[PDB]
Amino acid sequence: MTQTPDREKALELAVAQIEKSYGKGSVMRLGDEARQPISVIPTGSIALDVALGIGGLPRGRVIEIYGPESSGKTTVALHAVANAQAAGGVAAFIDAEHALDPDYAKKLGVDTDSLLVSQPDTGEQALEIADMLIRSGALDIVVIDSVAALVPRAELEVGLQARLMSQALRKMTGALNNSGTTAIFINQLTTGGKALKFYASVRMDVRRVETLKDGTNAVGNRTRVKVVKNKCLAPFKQAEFDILYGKGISREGSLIDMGVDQGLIRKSGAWFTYEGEQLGQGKENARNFLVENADVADEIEKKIKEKLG
Ligand SMILES: Nc1ncnc2c1ncn2[C@H]1C[C@H](O)[C@@H](COP(=O)(O)OP(=O)(O)OP(=O)(O)O)O1
Secondary structure, three states: OOOOOOHHHHHHHHHHHHHHHHOOOOOOOOOOOOOOOOOOEOOOOHHHHHHOOOOOEOOOOEEEEEOOOOOOHHHHHHHHHHHHHHOOOEEEEEEOOOOOOHHHHHHHOOOHHHOEEEOOOOHHHHHHHHHHHHHOOOEEEEEEEOOOOOOOOOOOOOOHHHHHHHHHHHHHHHHHHHHOOEEEEEEOOOOOHHHHHHHOOEEEEEEEEEOOEOOOOEOEEEEEEEEEEEOOOOOOEEEEEEEEOOOEEOHHHHHHHHHHOOOOOEEOOOEEEOOOOEEEEOHHHHHHHHHHOHHHHHHHHHHHHHHOO
16 A cells, blocks of 8 residues: 555544443553553552543552562552542552551551441452442442452362452442542452452552662662553553651652653752752751651642643
């Protein structure tokens, strides 16, 4: 063929139909401008929020946060919870690991007192209780800690967990689209993950990069999240942030990094300057600066969201 102009129109149609038959996000161009939804649960890391393209987690979708032991998964999830609550939303936690430490959760901004916690007796029950809560249309965000831990009733008394997820997720997936409840599934390191991989609209890969140090010992860790699946925005985008031991995700920390990576914060050797005055000498001070000077911190957050979306 020798075509050229009529191609960008035929393709356009193709896409358009693919879009309508299988839903928005069925095909995209990695370079495409992300759609901008109304509601979205911020993750608490401006970087991860943009890597997600929509500023936060989508609603009414199943999210999957997988990765190895102590990567930041539960942290990231607990944050998405602390934000859903901040907006006056109610959350639930389906515990099948019995490892949730509220003291920490509270420090992140979680209204632990109002947190609906469940601890099922079988993997089926877990999803059932999940579904039932979901359908009430009262929940905003539901976190199910560990897919690996939802053992079927049978085993508790041959690919059972696989079938279990499949069915469970088939049913649950519809109720979510109609309730606007986003559900997060934590995954270790794949059992029933085989299907979750497909039902999931967003799939994040969290891994621990470096053990953040500063003179003394490791006061935190540098986490790297990679969205390997994103049906709401072009996928394959990654982000890095710091989780300080006991503190969680350093918000300001992202403000700085994301700040300089957008020309909003100058770096003149150890010094972090922001449109005139100085923030501090050394990322930590800069960090500390923003944490006690919330006002400006918010200013920087606002300006990056104004510069991208
Ligand atoms: N109660 C706590 N107090 C202080 N730091 C904590 C606490 N819980 C977790 N962390 C810190 C230490 C770890 O480096 C980091 C782990 O994040 P986390 O979200 O708990 O990872 P994860 O959920 O992927 O792994 P895990 O399998 O251990 O549950 O957070």
